[PDB]
Every structure is written in C-alpha cells, then in structure tokens.
Paper text:
ATTR amyloidosis is caused by the deposition of transthyretin in the form of amyloid fibrils in virtually every organ of the body, including the heart. ATTR self-assemblage caused by mutations in the TTR gene leads to variant ATTR (ATTRv) amyloidosis. Using cryo-electron microscopy, we determined the structures of cardiac fibrils extracted from three ATTR amyloidosis patients carrying the ATTRv-I84S mutation, associated with a consistent clinical phenotype. The four structures determined in this study vary in the assembly of this gate, and we classify them as the closed gate, the open gate, the absent gate, and the broken gate folds.
The density map from the second 3D class obtained from the curvy fibrils from ATTRv-I84S patient 1 was determined at a resolution of 3.1 Å. The N- and C-terminal fragments have a residue composition of Pro 11 to Lys 35, and Thr 60 to Asn 124, respectively. These fibrils have a crossover distance of 608 Å, a twist of −1.41°, and rise of 4.8 Å. In contrast to the closed gate fold, the gate in this second 3D class assembles in an extended conformation. This open gate appears twisted by an angle of 180° from Gly 67 backward, resulting in new interactions with the N-terminal fragment. Based on the position of Ile 84 at a hydrophobic interface with Leu 58 and neighbor residues, we anticipate that the mutation to serine could disrupt this interface and then favor the extension and twisting of the gate. We classified this new structure as the open gate fold. The structural alignment of the open and closed gate folds emphasizes the differences between the two distinct conformations, with the residues preceding Gly 67 being the most variable. By tracing the fibril segments contributing to these two map densities back to their respective micrographs, we observe that the two polymorphs can coexist within the same fibril. In the open gate fold of ATTRv-I84S fibrils from patient 1, the gate is extended.
Residue numbers in the entry:
A (entry chain C), B (entry chain E), C (entry chain A), D (entry chain B): 10 to 36, 59 to 124
C-alpha cells in the first residue's frame, strides 16, 4: 500500500508560492495533535485563559477592568498574498 | 491499495499560489486532531476561555467590565489573495 | 508500504517560495504534539494564562486594571507574501 | 517500509526560499513536543503566565495596573516574504 504525494513537481518561471504540505500516516491513553501553519494575528486579545487547576477556590474577590482606547492604525498591504509581477505600495501622505 | 496525490504538477509561467495539501492516512482512549492552515485574525477577542478544573468554586465574587473604545483603523489590501500582474496600492492621503 | 513525498522537485527560474513540509509517521499515558510554522503576531495580548496549580486559593483579593492607549502605527507591506518581480515600497511622507 | 522525502531537489536560477522540513518518525508517562519554526513577534505582551505551583495561596492582595501609552511606529517591509527581483524600500521623509 504505497503512498505518493507530488506538489509543484516541475516549476519553470518565477512564481510566488506559499506551500504547506502535511502528510500524516498512523499505524487511560490520550493523544493531542495541534498543527498550525501560516497563522497571522494582528490585534488579538485573550484575557482569561487556561487558569489552571482550581484557581480562586475559596471566597475569591476579583475586580477586572479592561479598556482598549487609543489611536492605532494597522496598514497592511498583501497579507498572506504572494504576487508575481505587481506593485505593492503603501503611500501614507 | 496505493494512494496518489498530484497538486500543481507542471507549472510554467509566473503564478501566485497558496497551496495547502493535507494527506491523512490512518491504520479509555481519546484522540484529538486540530489542524489550522492559513488562519488570519485581525481583531479577535476572547475574554473567558478554558478557565480550567473547578475555578471560582466557593462563594466567588467576580466583577468583570470590558470597554472597546478608540479610533482604530485596519486598512488591508489583498488579504489572503495572491495576485499575478496587478497594482495593489493603499493610498492614505 | 513505502511513503514518498516530492515538493518542488525541479525548480528552474527565480521564484519566491515559502515551503513548510511536515511528514509524520507513527508506529496513564499522555502525548501532546504542538507544531507551529510561519506564525506572525504583530500586536498580541495575553493577560492571565496558565496560572498553574491552585493559585489564589484562600481569600484572594485581586484588582487588575489594563489600559491600551497611545498612538501606535503598524505599517507592514508584504506580510507572509513572497514576490518575484515587484516593487514593495512603504513611502511615509 | 521505506520513507522518502524530496524538497527542492534540483534548483537552477536565483530563487529566494524559506524552507522548513520537519520529518517525524516514531517507533504514569507523559511526552510533550513543542516545535516552532519561523515565528515572528513584533509587539507581544504576556502579563501573568505560568505562575507556578500554588502561588498567592493565603490572603493575597495584588494590585496590578498596566498602561500601554506612547508613540511607537513599527514600519516593516517584506516580513517573512522573500523576493527575487524586486525593490524593497522604506522611505520615511
């Protein structure tokens, strides 16, 4: 039972490529698989995550306040987008 | 029982490509598979996530306040969009 | 049962490529696999994460205040986007 | 059961490539695998992380205040994006 994978075998020219090839062959127990390829996070927020095993167990008093306030400019040209013969310009006068 | 996969075998020219090829062959127990390819998160918020095993068990007093307030500009041209012969410009006068 | 993987075998020219090839072959117990390739985080925030084993157990008093306020400019051209014959310019007059 | 991987076998020309090839072959117990390749973090913040085993156990009083305020410019051209025959310029007049 052979397995064969061909991706972009013969490439002639000047391309602009993003390639992600994931080949997986397999064969109280737990197994976890977390694969992440080409992940972009520009403005990402996580406040409470994975607090753990029994936090704040007894009479916890938590006062959490969060403010997202301010001039923030995120100017991106060609995010995760390859180009071959083009003109990518960010002109901020 | 052979398995054969061909993606973009012969490429002549100047393309702009995003390629994601995932080949999977298989054969108290738990198995978890989490694959993420080409994930873009510009403004993503998660406040309470995966707090864990028995948090805030006994007489918890939590005061959570969240405010999203402010001038934020997210100017993106060609997000996850390859281009071959084009003109991608972000002109902010 | 042979396994064969070919990616970008014969490349003639001047391409601009990102290649990520992950080949996986396998065969109280726990196994965890975390693979991350080409991960970009421009403005990423994590306030409370993995606090551990039983933190803040007894009569915790936590006052957390967070403010994101200020002029911040993130000007990016060609993020995770290779280019072959192009003109990437960031002109900030 | 042979395993064979070919990536960019014959390259003729002047490309600009990022290559990441991860080949994995395998065969109270715990195993953890954390692989990270091509990770970029421009402005990344982690305030509370991995606090440990039972911190702040008894009558903790924590006052945490955080302010992100100030003129910060992050001008990047060609982030994680190789180019072959191009003109990458950051002109800040």
């Amino acid at each position: 039972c052979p397995l064969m994978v061909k991706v972009l075998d013969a490439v002639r020219g000047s391309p602009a490529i993003n390639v992600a090839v994931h080949v997986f062959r397999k064969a109280t127990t737990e197994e976890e698989f977390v694969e992440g390829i080409y992940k972009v996070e520009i403005d990402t927020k996580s406040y409470w995550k994975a607090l753990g095993s029994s936090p704040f167990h007894e009479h916890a008093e938590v006062v959490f306040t969060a403010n997202d306030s301010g001039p923030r400019r995120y100017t991106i040209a060609a995010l995760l987008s390859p180009y071959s013969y083009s003109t990518t310009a960010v002109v901020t006068n």
